[PDB]
């Protein structure tokens, strides 16, 4: 149990911000924390690195104080755009944050080449592009063991390979007991990296688990669609028999919503009966799931196109 | 030339005492015996136009209430209208009226003459170059010249080689030099007023005289102008606007090395003092800059304290304060930059006054006193008017 | 233009003194600018400007009399020699216009007939100082 | 120790700055013009009159270019939200940008009055070096703590504004109401009122303002002319010995400093 | 009819030839994305369809005519990444000044204010306004008049997830009217839901075109099947051992299987046959895996176990 | 046209502009604390005026502009702005005109209370020379302003980070309003008899803040020429930076 949040329902200026949010996070899963209205999301965020104060609530990270600095010491926060120091270089910026954090200095030197910054180690961070400094700000949160990871949008302005094998070294470190929270608004992609969502609203955390639970506790329909063949005489009725509207867009995309419960007999349909190329069951998404939670609290679905 | 005799005086008194009746005369007239006479208002002693018209020759003469006019004109026989020679000591001019374009009164050689109230109106039309003076005074000792008033002559009261005499409340009026001073050692002039004039004082070669209480109001280029004045005493002045025409100094010194400059008054002119680079360390504390557009000009780098026993001068532009309640001001005042004398130095910078550069070295110098060169300053300058009676 | 040392007339003013320059005996300096001529005077009158600091860095040539080669009294404008190169005596009896005589001449052996007829001594121009000019005025006309 | 830490970046943050590096050599070539103007004039009361004055127009600029950005220019950078989730206080990294952009200061005019020392005893011959050495030694250890109030101060102002172009509008008033503007509504204040508005309350208004007694300190020993005073001739009818002008100039610190770590303790 | 025919481009700056030999033909109402890593192309490619570059040896054909004419740029909408507008102007005015240069009517700025959701916070300053505000007053002067080609480089940078998925809802609401778009994005989950075919280029060429079901088909990439309890895990793991497929050996009740989706048809078959496919995901080979596999076809040797 | 409606933006941005309310403002008390101490304490106080508005024009000229093209570029606008229906020359001069219609309103307030600090506290000014000695000064001020604008633009298409174009619009408010005339008195003092003095006020006409105090201070140049080289100062610092801004 290394994040330890119990009923922190944290009030400033009289507003109430945040309410009874309780969130306990085991010592190797991957928790993603999304917010929209509400900006929990953000006082959350600052509640678990110790530097707001929880009122009406505590919260114990480590099994300690937030704000202890035997535990300040194995926490890593990688924060939304840090243009570091712009006439430092690279190193002395990473060897100025291993003095501070109490690691060795032997780590700089394995953290600019574990992270892709040894060719621009030694040049100055206003000669650095966007995804340089999301490197330089990784390798100053991997410093000195981290025993808790806490990254708010950790690949914005960074490129697709360093981005797939950003979320490799993420799961390395889960590997290693590291518990990692990934606070971001890019949703679809880190669904397949993270272990429980928490989707907070409005103050309120709404729902908590993982993506099989949040399925489960929301029903909403899989998309499935059937290249091979579309044509319509029977391919719309035979599956409009149990109420599953076999809706298309195109030449062959008909994208069944159905209600996972009949994936027996829709797939005996599908094989029994016409020969398809390549069926895609797209499972709801975290994109879907998340509108479905959002709309539960206080969103209404917008127009056509009109935001 | 005929005499005074040969005309038709009725004596009042017989001490030698005649009175020439009302009505005109002509040419000239010598005075050889020591006659004390007067004169009716319409004694109209009108020459031709040549020659002195009134020569005298006798001692102890008291000519009164004549009225000369139209002598001649030759400057280098001296024709003047009263004559007096040198064996003509003591001789009294009192209250008559001239108008001729010659000398007024030419003394020569004379010892107590004096010149008492006569109004001489000289010329109007001749350049300033030969309209003869008009208290023309050359080598007395004695003289007395008091109450006049000089118009439109040459050079005023000319005064040359004269010891001691006395020049007291003439008004002169309209002339190219007020009063001329050459080589006139321990002479005295008090409460003259000058109008109008190319320089208003002539103070020149002349040592160890007093200049006292005399008035010059809108003369012309040069307020009272010192030339190699020695142990002189100018105290209680009145210069009041001096405009171009130089371009208008209220005092200029030239190689005047010892003299006691006090409580005078240089009022709205272009220049207040131009203080020439031969003429230091001389006692110059009590006066009132009032109104100038610059004070002092000192083209030097020789530093030059301008107040004698604690006490300075007033100026119009000190901006400074007094925390004790004394007369002085607590900081010292420097009249002049270095760009105040980058522009007399060189005339060119007239093109760069403007400039925020030059004004940036303006605020330099009260910031940085090491390129301060050392001017022309008095510490303990006056915080009041000194010359509270001047003004009238 | 510089090269020229104008002719005085009767209707010429000092510079400093102002008053007008033929009624007087003695050399007479002037000061060719070659922007506006200015005529002096004295030559002692002029040797006080001269040493001004106005006038220390103006190109100007000075132009005195020869009175080596001209009557004293009434020195005619023609023979007008440089004044850089001359031999100035002071210390004479003679009467010059404003300051002390400083007859000038041209070949000094002239100039030392008179220094040693009046009791004077020979000098040369860059010898010329203000302490000198209101040292010889004193011993002229003082006492 | 954190402090030291993080004073070690600001050392090697500052001297990097190319703005730094031109106007502390800008103090380094004048210091050396006015002392050698100094020496061929041969006077000293001018001499330090005037370098007191040089240490007025730059050691608050020094002081005010290193940080006027020193908190706000890392909050709004992200990296001061990053460095409190670092094992630290408030209170250390406020006195360690204190640290380190103090011994930038404490290293600029050891570098200007130091080749200003030796364009003296290399230039005019004869002097004094024990009186030498005293009077620069004096103008080292009171310019530095002139240059450590406007560092103090540049914390306040970095402290209360929340955008760095709302920052540098404040550290451009500071530089031009104390330099330059004090200076001169307390001469307008004489001037109009010919000095009769206050003779005794007006000397002690010159306490409130560390760069008039900054000029106070140097000038102890070398009082001269007048006009190199101006409105420092109020300084002769202050009471208070130079003991305790000392001690105005470190409460200008102490005061100034404690009120940035108030206003960075609610940032 | 083309909206962007880039026919054979070649682009040099010196010696280097920072974009060579690209060819594209982009449709009448097709969402292309643009992918670029180590190269510029995607930069230049970027430049070279706006009229800010000119092609060194080849042409470009935007909308019919050259891409410089200002009656292409008046149906031309782009949004570029990270802008940030005049902070001391409004939201609103903004707009009305965008509009007056484009030619569009002013009764347009106050719908599209309203159709981004920036009515709340129009008449406020723009240096009071987030990351995400800023987005959508980019993305609504884009909008502006009746535009035939977007390029919308990097649009969902900062923004709300609500906000996301309705700026690709208004995506395919614009498409089906005839305005083809081009995505130019590096989060490549996201777009691969709407995007109509891909345009992934390496350093310097141009490595595939065509739809997602065209580089699946031609990458042969392996399919990520993953069920949960159909018959028994330990049962149906040797299965395709010894059919010659992977089966992953997950903790408990779980069939991860990696096949060739090539026999797939069949395969899956015998999997419905011994159990019920009530919880399985076949995965095919993303937009994120079939860029990372053709950075591999050229050049770029991958990183080690977890490195980078 | 265009060049009008990039120009109303101008407007309203830079009214907006806090740097410039605050020097705008201190220009025009200072127009009025000039003019307060110098007539009751007109050519002569016009001077003093002229070195005022030779401090403050070009630094309100340069505190509009020096971001004008390289603040675009780094606010991504730039970029959008060239994909309009728009030239790289009606950018500039759209620029050009919308920030100098600003100081052309910053001497109607700061001249604009000057004098009417004068014609309410002189009663004998004879205001028929007032409305032509300072229709003279305004006209003349903002023509300085608009060479420092100009000057603003040549900086600004040239840097690439706004950093540094406030690092040189510092180095031209330097060289070209106290450091070319003090390099000017500079020389003189050095050297004097060898320096022509008739080629220093021919050496003054490459200097747009002394061109614009000999229009007001009215010599071997006549006056029409100094307007001519005034706005040849425009026009060339004009056409450079139209060179320079199609150089990107
Ligand atoms: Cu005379
Ligand atoms: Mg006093
Ligand atoms: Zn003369």
Same mark, same amino acid.
């Given at each position: 149990?290394?994040?330890?949040?119990?009923?922190?329902?944290?009030?400033?200026?009289?507003?109430?911000?945040?309410?009874?949010?309780?969130?306990?996070?085991?010592?190797?899963?991957?928790?993603? @924390?999304?917010?929209?209205?509400?900006?929990?999301?953000?006082?959350?965020?600052?509640?678990?690195?110790?530097?707001?104060?929880?009122?009406?609530?505590?919260?114990?990270?480590?099994?300690?104080?937030?704000?202890?600095?035997?535990?300040?010491?194995?926490?890593?926060?990688?924060?939304?755009?840090?243009?570091?120091?712009?006439?430092?270089?690279?190193?002395?910026? @990473?060897?100025?944050?291993?003095?501070?954090?109490?690691?060795?200095?032997?780590?700089?030197?394995?953290?600019?080449?574990?992270?892709?910054?040894?060719?621009?180690?030694?040049?100055?961070?206003?000669?650095?592009?966007?995804?340089?400094?999301?490197?330089?700000?990784?390798?100053?949160?991997?410093?000195?063991?981290?025993?808790?990871?806490?990254?708010?949008?950790?690949?914005?302005?960074?490129?697709?390979?360093?981005?797939?094998?950003?979320?490799?070294?993420?799961?390395?470190?889960?590997?290693?007991?590291?518990?990692?929270?990934?606070?971001?608004?890019?949703?679809?992609?880190?669904?397949?990296?993270?272990?429980?969502?928490?989707?907070?609203?409005?103050?309120?955390?709404?729902?908590?688990?993982?993506?099989?639970?949040?399925?489960?506790?929301?029903?909403?329909?899989?998309?499935?669609?059937?290249?091979?063949?579309?044509?319509?005489?029977?391919?719309?009725?035979?599956?409009?028999?149990?109420?599953?509207?076999?809706?298309?867009?195109?030449?062959?995309?008909?994208?069944?919503?159905?209600?996972?419960?009949?994936?027996?007999?829709?797939?005996?349909?599908? @094989?029994?009966?016409?020969?398809?190329?390549?069926?895609?069951?797209?499972?709801?998404?975290?994109?879907? @799931?998340?509108?479905?939670?959002?709309?539960?609290?206080?969103?209404?679905?917008?127009?056509?196109?009109?935001? | 030339?005929?005499?005074?005799?040969?005309?038709?005086?009725?004596?009042?008194?017989?001490?030698?005492?005649?009175?020439?009746?009302?009505?005109?005369?002509?040419?000239?007239?010598?005075?050889?015996?020591?006659?004390?006479?007067?004169?009716?208002?319409?004694?109209?002693?009108?020459?031709?136009?040549? %020659?002195?018209?009134?020569?005298?020759?006798?001692?102890?003469?008291?000519?009164?209430?004549?009225?000369?006019?139209?002598?001649?004109?030759?400057?280098?026989?001296?024709?003047?209208?009263?004559?007096?020679?040198?064996?003509?000591?003591?001789?009294?001019?009192?209250?008559?009226?001239?108008?001729?374009?010659?000398?007024?009164?030419?003394?020569?050689?004379?010892?107590?003459?004096?010149?008492?109230?006569?109004?001489?109106? %000289?010329?109007?039309?001749?350049?300033?170059?030969?309209?003869?003076?008009?208290?023309?005074?050359?080598?007395?000792?004695?003289?007395?010249?008091?109450?006049?008033?000089?118009?439109?002559?040459?050079?005023?009261?000319?005064?040359?080689?004269?010891?001691?005499?006395?020049?007291?409340?003439?008004?002169?009026?309209?002339?190219?030099?007020?009063?001329?001073?050459?080589?006139?050692?321990?002479?005295?002039?008090?409460?003259?007023?000058?109008?109008?004039?190319?320089?208003?004082?002539?103070?020149?070669?002349?040592?160890?005289?007093?200049?006292?209480?005399?008035?010059?109001?809108?003369?012309?280029?040069?307020?009272?102008?010192?030339?190699?004045?020695?142990?002189?005493?100018?105290?209680?002045?009145?210069?009041?606007?001096?405009?171009?025409?130089?371009?208008?100094?209220?005092?200029?010194?030239?190689?005047?090395?010892?003299?006691?400059?006090?409580?005078?008054?240089?009022?709205?002119?272009?220049?207040?003092?131009?203080?020439?680079?031969?003429?230091?360390?001389?006692?110059?504390?009590?006066?009132?800059?009032?109104?100038?557009?610059?004070?002092?000009?000192?083209?030097?780098?020789?530093?030059?304290?301008?107040?004698?026993? %604690?006490? %300075?001068?007033?100026?119009?532009?000190?901006?400074?304060?007094?925390?004790?309640?004394?007369?002085?001001?607590?900081?010292?005042?420097?009249?002049?930059?270095?760009?105040?004398?980058?522009?007399?130095?060189?005339?060119?910078?007239?093109?760069?006054?403007?400039?925020?550069?030059?004004?940036?070295?303006?605020?330099?110098?009260?910031?940085?006193?090491?390129?301060?060169?050392?001017?022309?300053?008095?510490?303990?300058?006056?915080?009041?008017?000194?010359?509270?009676?001047?003004?009238? | 233009?510089?090269?020229?040392?104008?002719?005085? &007339?009767?209707?010429?003013?000092?510079?400093?003194?102002?008053?007008?320059?033929?009624?007087?005996?003695?050399?007479?300096?002037?000061?060719?600018?070659?922007?506006?001529?200015?005529?002096?005077?004295?030559?002692?009158?002029?040797?006080?400007?001269?040493?001004?600091?106005?006038?220390?860095?103006?190109?100007?040539?000075?132009?005195? &009399?020869?009175?080596?080669?001209?009557?004293?009294?009434?020195?005619?404008?023609?023979?007008?020699?440089?004044?850089?190169?001359?031999?100035?005596?002071?210390?004479?009896?003679?009467?010059?216009?404003?300051?002390?005589?400083?007859?000038?001449?041209?070949?000094?052996?002239?100039?030392?007939?008179?220094?040693?007829?009046?009791?004077?001594?020979?000098?040369?121009?860059?010898?010329?100082?203000?302490?000198?000019?209101?040292?010889?005025?004193?011993?002229? &006309?003082?006492? | 120790?954190?402090?030291?830490?993080?004073?070690?970046?600001?050392?090697?943050?500052?001297?990097?700055?190319?703005?730094?590096?031109?106007?502390?050599?800008?103090?380094?070539?004048?210091?050396?013009?006015?002392?050698?103007?100094?020496?061929?004039?041969?006077?000293?009361?001018?001499?330090?009159?005037?370098?007191?004055?040089?240490?007025?127009?730059?050691?608050?600029?020094?002081?005010?270019? +290193?940080?006027?950005?020193?908190?706000?220019?890392?909050?709004?950078?992200?990296?001061?939200?990053?460095?409190?989730?670092?094992?630290?206080?408030?209170?250390?990294?406020?006195?360690?940008?204190?640290?380190?952009?103090?011994?930038?200061?404490?290293?600029?005019?050891?570098?200007?009055?130091?080749?200003?020392?030796?364009?003296?005893?290399?230039?005019?011959?004869?002097?004094?070096?024990?009186?030498?050495?005293?009077?620069?030694?004096?103008?080292?250890?009171?310019?530095?703590?002139?240059?450590?109030?406007?560092?103090?101060?540049?914390?306040?102002?970095?402290?209360?504004?929340?955008?760095?172009?709302?920052?540098?509008?404040?550290?451009?008033?500071?530089?031009?109401?104390?330099?330059?503007?004090?200076?001169?509504?307390?001469?307008?204040? +004489?001037?109009?009122?010919?000095?009769?508005?206050?003779?005794?309350?007006?000397?002690?208004?010159?306490?409130?303002?560390?760069?008039?007694?900054?000029?106070?300190?140097? +000038?102890?020993?070398?009082?001269?002319?007048?006009?190199?005073?101006?409105?420092?001739?109020?300084?002769?009818?202050?009471?208070?010995?130079?003991?305790?002008?000392?001690?105005?100039?470190?409460?200008?610190?102490?005061?100034?400093?404690? +009120?940035?770590?108030?206003?960075?303790?609610?940032?």
């Amino acid at each position: 149990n290394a994040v330890e949040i119990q009923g922190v329902s944290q009030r400033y200026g009289s507003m109430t911000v945040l309410h009874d949010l309780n969130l306990n996070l085991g010592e190797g899963e991957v928790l993603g @924390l999304f917010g929209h209205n509400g900006a929990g999301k953000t006082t959350s965020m600052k509640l678990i690195l110790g530097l707001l104060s929880p009122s009406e609530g505590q919260v114990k990270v480590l099994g300690r104080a937030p704000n202890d600095p035997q535990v300040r010491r194995q926490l890593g926060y990688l924060p939304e755009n840090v243009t570091f120091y712009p006439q430092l270089s690279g190193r002395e910026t @990473l060897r100025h944050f291993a003095r501070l954090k109490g690691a060795a200095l032997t780590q700089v030197d394995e953290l600019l080449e574990q992270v892709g910054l040894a060719h621009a180690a030694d040049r100055r961070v206003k000669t650095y592009s966007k995804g340089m400094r999301q490197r330089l700000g990784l390798a100053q949160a991997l410093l000195g063991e981290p025993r808790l990871l806490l990254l708010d949008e950790p690949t914005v302005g960074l490129d697709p390979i360093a981005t797939q094998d950003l979320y490799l070294l993420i799961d390395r470190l889960r590997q290693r007991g590291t518990s990692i929270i990934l606070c971001s608004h890019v949703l679809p992609g880190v669904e397949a990296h993270i272990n429980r969502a928490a989707i907070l609203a409005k103050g309120c955390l709404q729902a908590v688990g993982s993506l099989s639970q949040l399925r489960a506790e929301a029903g909403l329909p899989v998309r499935i669609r059937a290249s091979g063949i579309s044509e319509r005489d029977s391919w719309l009725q035979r599956w409009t028999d149990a109420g599953h509207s076999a809706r298309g867009l195109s030449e062959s995309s008909i994208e069944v919503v159905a209600v996972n419960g009949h994936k027996l007999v829709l797939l005996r349909q599908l @094989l029994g009966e016409g020969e398809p190329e390549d069926i895609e069951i797209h499972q709801p998404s975290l994109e879907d @799931l998340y509108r479905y939670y959002m709309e539960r609290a206080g969103d209404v679905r917008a127009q056509e196109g009109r935001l | 030339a005929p005499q005074s005799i040969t005309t038709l005086p009725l004596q009042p008194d017989g001490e030698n005492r005649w009175r020439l009746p009302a009505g005109e005369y002509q040419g000239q007239f010598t005075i050889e015996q020591p006659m004390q006479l007067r004169c009716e208002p319409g004694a109209v002693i009108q020459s031709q136009g040549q %020659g002195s018209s009134l020569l005298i020759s006798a001692p102890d003469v008291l000519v009164e209430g004549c009225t000369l006019y139209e002598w001649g004109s030759d400057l280098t026989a001296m024709d003047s209208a009263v004559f007096i020679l040198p064996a003509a000591e003591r001789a009294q001019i009192s209250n008559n009226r001239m108008r001729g374009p010659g000398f007024g009164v030419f003394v020569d050689g004379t010892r107590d003459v004096q010149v008492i109230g006569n109004e001489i109106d %000289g010329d109007a039309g001749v350049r300033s170059q030969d309209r003869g003076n008009g208290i023309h005074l050359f080598a007395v000792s004695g003289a007395r010249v008091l109450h006049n008033h000089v118009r439109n002559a040459r050079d005023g009261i000319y005064i040359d080689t004269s010891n001691g005499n006395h020049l007291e409340g003439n008004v002169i009026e309209d002339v190219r030099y007020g009063v001329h001073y050459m080589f006139a050692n321990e002479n005295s002039l008090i409460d003259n007023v000058t109008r109008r004039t190319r320089t208003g004082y002539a103070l020149m070669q002349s040592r160890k005289l007093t200049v006292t209480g005399n008035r010059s109001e809108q003369d012309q280029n040069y307020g009272i102008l010192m030339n190699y004045i020695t142990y002189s005493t100018i105290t209680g002045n009145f210069v009041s606007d001096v405009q171009r025409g130089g371009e208008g100094k209220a005092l200029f010194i030239y190689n005047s090395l010892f003299n006691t400059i006090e409580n005078n008054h240089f009022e709205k002119s272009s220049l207040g003092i131009h203080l020439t680079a031969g003429s230091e360390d001389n006692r110059i504390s009590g006066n009132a800059f009032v109104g100038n557009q610059q004070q002092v000009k000192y083209v030097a780098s020789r530093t030059q304290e301008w107040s004698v026993d %604690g006490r %300075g001068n007033y100026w119009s532009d000190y901006l400074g304060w007094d925390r004790n309640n004394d007369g002085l001001g607590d900081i010292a005042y420097e009249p002049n930059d270095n760009v105040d004398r980058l522009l007399w130095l060189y005339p060119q910078v007239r093109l760069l006054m403007n400039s925020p550069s030059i004004e940036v070295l303006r605020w330099v110098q009260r910031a940085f006193p090491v390129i301060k060169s050392p001017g022309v300053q008095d510490s303990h300058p006056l915080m009041k008017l000194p010359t509270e009676k001047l003004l009238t | 233009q510089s090269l020229e040392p104008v002719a005085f &007339h009767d209707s010429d003013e000092c510079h400093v003194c102002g008053m007008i320059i033929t009624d007087f005996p003695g050399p007479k300096g002037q000061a060719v600018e070659k922007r506006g001529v200015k005529k002096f005077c004295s030559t002692a009158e002029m040797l006080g400007w001269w040493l001004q600091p106005e006038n220390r860095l103006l190109d100007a040539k000075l132009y005195v &009399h020869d009175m080596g080669r001209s009557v004293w009294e009434k020195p005619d404008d023609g023979h007008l020699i440089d004044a850089t190169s001359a031999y100035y005596v002071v210390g004479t009896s003679l009467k010059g216009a404003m300051g002390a005589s400083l007859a000038s001449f041209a070949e000094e052996q002239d100039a030392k007939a008179l220094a040693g007829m009046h009791g004077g001594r020979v000098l040369r121009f860059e010898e010329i100082d203000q302490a000198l000019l209101q040292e010889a005025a004193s011993m002229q &006309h003082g006492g | 120790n954190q402090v030291w830490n993080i004073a070690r970046k600001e050392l090697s943050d500052g001297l990097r700055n190319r703005w730094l590096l031109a106007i502390s050599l800008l103090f380094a070539v004048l210091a050396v013009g006015i002392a050698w103007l100094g020496a061929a004039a041969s006077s000293i009361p001018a001499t330090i009159a005037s370098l007191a004055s040089l240490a007025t127009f730059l050691m608050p600029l020094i002081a005010l270019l +290193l940080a006027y950005d020193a908190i706000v220019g890392e909050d709004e950078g992200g990296t001061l939200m990053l460095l409190l989730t670092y094992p630290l206080g408030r209170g250390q990294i406020l006195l360690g940008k204190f640290v380190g952009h103090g011994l930038i200061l404490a290293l600029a005019v050891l570098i200007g009055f130091g080749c200003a020392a030796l364009a003296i005893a290399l230039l005019v011959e004869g002097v004094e070096l024990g009186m030498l050495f005293w009077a620069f030694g004096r103008f080292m250890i009171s310019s530095t703590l002139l240059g450590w109030v406007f560092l103090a101060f540049a914390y306040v102002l970095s402290g209360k504004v929340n955008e760095k172009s709302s920052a540098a509008g404040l550290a451009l008033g500071v530089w031009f109401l104390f330099v330059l503007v004090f200076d001169l509504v307390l001469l307008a204040l +004489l001037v109009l009122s010919e000095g009769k508005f206050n003779p005794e309350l007006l000397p002690w208004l010159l306490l409130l303002n560390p760069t008039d007694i900054y000029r106070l300190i140097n +000038l102890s020993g070398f009082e001269g002319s007048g006009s190199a005073m101006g409105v420092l001739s109020l300084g002769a009818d202050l009471p208070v010995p130079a003991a305790v002008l000392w001690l105005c100039l470190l409460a200008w610190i102490g005061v100034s400093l404690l +009120l940035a770590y108030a206003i960075f303790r609610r940032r």
